[PDB]
Amino acid sequence: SNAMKVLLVLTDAYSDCEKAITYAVNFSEKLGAELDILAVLEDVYNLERANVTFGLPFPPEIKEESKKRIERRLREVWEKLTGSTEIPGVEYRIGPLSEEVKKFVEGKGYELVVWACYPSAYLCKVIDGLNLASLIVK
Amino acid sequence: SNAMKVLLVLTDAYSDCEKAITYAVNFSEKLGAELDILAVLEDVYNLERANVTFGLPFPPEIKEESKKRIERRLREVWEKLTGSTEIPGVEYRIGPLSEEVKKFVEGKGYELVVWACYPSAYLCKVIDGLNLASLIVK
Numbered sequence: 001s002n003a004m005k006v007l008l009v010l011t012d013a014y015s016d017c018e019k020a021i022t023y024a025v026n027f028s029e030k031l032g033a034e035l036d037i038l039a040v041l042e043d044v045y046n047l048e049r050a051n052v053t054f055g056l057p058f059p060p061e062i063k064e065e066s067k068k069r070i071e072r073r074l075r076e077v078w079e080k081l082t083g084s085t086e087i088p089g090v091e092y093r094i095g096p097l098s099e100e101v102k103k104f105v106e107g108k109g110y111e112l113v114v115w116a117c118y119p120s121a122y123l124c125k126v127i128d129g130l131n132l133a134s135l136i137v138k
Numbered sequence: 139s140n141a142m143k144v145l146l147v148l149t150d151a152y153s154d155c156e157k158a159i160t161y162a163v164n165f166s167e168k169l170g171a172e173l174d175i176l177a178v179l180e181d182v183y184n185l186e187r188a189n190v191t192f193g194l195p196f197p198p199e200i201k202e203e204s205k206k207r208i209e210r211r212l213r214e215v216w217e218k219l220t221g222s223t224e225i226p227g228v229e230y231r232i233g234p235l236s237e238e239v240k241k242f243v244e245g246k247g248y249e250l251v252v253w254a255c256y257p258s259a260y261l262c263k264v265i266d267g268l269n270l271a272s273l274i275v276k
Contacts, residue, residue: 019271030168120272124262127274133161134258136265136272 003034007110009101010039010090011118012066020116020137021077027114029082037087038104039070041094048094067092098126105130142171143247147239148208148228148254150181155255158275159215162252167220174248175228177208178238186232205230236264243268 008024010017027033044063050056067090075085093100097118105113114135115123127134146162148155165171182201189196205228213223231238235256243251252273253261265272 023271026169031164120266121262124259124265128258131276133157133276134274136274138269138271 001034004031004112005108005110006033006035006112006114007105008035008037008114008116009097009118010037010070010116011043011097012039012041012070013043014117015039015066015070015073017073017117017137018077020114020135021074022081023135023137024114025078025081027112033112035088036110037074037090038101039067039090039092040097040100041066041092042097045094045096063092063094097122098129101126102129105132142169142249144171144173144250144252145243145246145248146173146175146252146254147235147256148175148177148212149235149256150177150179150183150204150208152255152257153207153211155211155275156215158252158254158273159212160219161273161275163216163219165250165252166226171250173226175212175226176239176242177205177228177230178235179204179230179232180235180238183232183234201232235260236267239264240267243270 004027006024006027008020024035028035041063044066047058047062051058071090074087078087079085091104093104110132112133112135113130114137116137120136120138123136144162144165146159162173166173179201182204185200186196209225209228212225212228216225217223229242231242248270250271250273251268253275255275258274258276261274
């Protein structure tokens, strides 16, 4: 299969990134790429850590709230561009971006990774540590 | 118009960069983008410098030949993808990459920059500085 394997990486903290989601849809459609979506819940992760550190409690529903904000944002763009709201399945990982992207992506052969509106300064390292093209959407 | 403006940034130093040039072509083709090409002769620049410091002769052929190799390399990939040798015009600039790209892009409305295999490690600052998406092709 010559299907360009692409991964869209989303953050629950920067779920409003139409430009990135658009790039992905265009690769999927116009370039026939095999698209997968990974959403890292970094904010939910920081909650877990504040919990351990200060004993700050938080409702398990928080996970779902983020999952839905993300999924809604996907449908909006997908429908707007594709007239359809059938989006890919979303894989959720709770932890540090770099670390989680690395784990997830390993040995899956992704030719490209599209980073959704995440602060560039913090990607510099991972992008280098990864052997695949990176599309930094600002 | 509603045609996405993309800039392909080629460099003096890093020759063999087919993958990057390829992504660029595809955007022009499948994604109907208005692609422009910019080649920063960084190696030539660093030479004019060592010239001044040491006063060693600096033949005009170096520059011309540097442009010719680049053009050849474009044609190869271009031709391999589209049966045509017809290639966009290349704009040459002689200076530090980071510096030259900022100036060139200056209010031109480019929304995406495809980096031609220049070490991603060195672009960290420039990518963050720029207000457009960056496709790092390793």
